[PDB]
Assembly symmetry: D2
Homo-oligomer: 115 residues x 4
């Protein structure tokens, strides 16, 4: 599991469940090509997106469909989605956790990168 995504709900104090997540890899012509996707689990986590062999160095975008999440709760949100854009860098044998903490008009994201 080189790449894991975790989404939390700051309004209800819970995992953000059944949130759609799309990962893209930046192509040579600067466009975003689909790479992997899924929905967060009951624990707010999305595992199994990719493998060590497939996850090469490059620029990646993680798009979290926050708008649909809030609308399913009857809450009008600000953002269309949350986007996290980063470079994967091999300098070391490591795993990336992209975590996002969601509010209707705000979100915060951090990377936990470990060996």
């Amino acid at each position: 599991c080189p790449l894991m995504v975790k989404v939390l709900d700051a309004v209800r104090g819970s995992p953000a469940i059944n949130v759609a997540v799309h990962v893209f890899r930046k192509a040579a012509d600067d466009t975003w090509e689909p790479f992997a996707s899924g929905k967060t689990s009951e624990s707010g986590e999305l595992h199994g997106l990719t493998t060590e062999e497939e996850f090469v160095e490059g620029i990646y975008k993680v798009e979290i469909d926050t708008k649909s999440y809030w609308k399913a709760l009857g809450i009008s949100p600000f953002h269309e989605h949350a986007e996290v854009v980063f470079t994967a860098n091999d300098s070391g044998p490591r795993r990336y956790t992209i975590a996002a903490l969601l509010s209707p008009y705000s979100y915060s994201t951090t990377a936990v990168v470990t060996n």
Copy 2:
């Protein structure tokens, strides 16, 4: 204005209005002595808490009454309040803005510290 507090609401996308704020300073006997208090304005800002003369070196606690805020709005929040504890002015006088961003089960606080 050596000490300012600003509070935002992450549910409403607005300033957090009418938030009570209590400031304490640690005394020589290690207890928290009341130092200043007030509430945020329509802009979510609290000015005029203290003066350059009275805001001496020390350890200060800024207590933001988030529970009263959310409850006054009919929401049941997780935290009792948000506490910001810091040493101030120990390299001479600085100006401090304490900012807080509130959600019912989460808050974040940052400080902007400038040299006048």
Copy 3:
């Protein structure tokens, strides 16, 4: 000033100065058209990006160039930039402040939306 961007530095406890900001608007063909750009001032604020007339209904992307900011400071950050994507003015004109708080491996963004 219908659109303002403010950026703070959580490592330094200061405004984030000289941060480049690019704004895009989604076009009819679903591509991102350049809309406005600038950089944050000494106060960490970026004013004058647009006007009430030109800031029409649409989907906007505010790209904050956090990597260039941290690298200009000799730090190697995680993110390429911070992107804030939102529908604006679809219930009539509003004023938007987009705030971002930056660390090398983390950022948070909030919006304050007011009705003039």
Copy 4:
């Protein structure tokens, strides 16, 4: 594990390891009495602080010694510590995760409360 604490470092993108954490329970005279304490692990987590039998309803304070953490990294921080103060409420059979994300001049804390 009714109560777990997790601490993350936003500067290095890692767990915050070997961070001292003290939990207090508010006593009838409004004073804070020591309840439980420990140091975060290699994963930034502190488990085993208390038990279901001991963790009754009441007001609790979790104090995270952020100052020592940053000083051990040669970074001058703003806060003396991070304090998280909350009421434990039985309305439901649940577990509390108190998470904190640390920067030198800022911190953010969220509660993830689950069954």
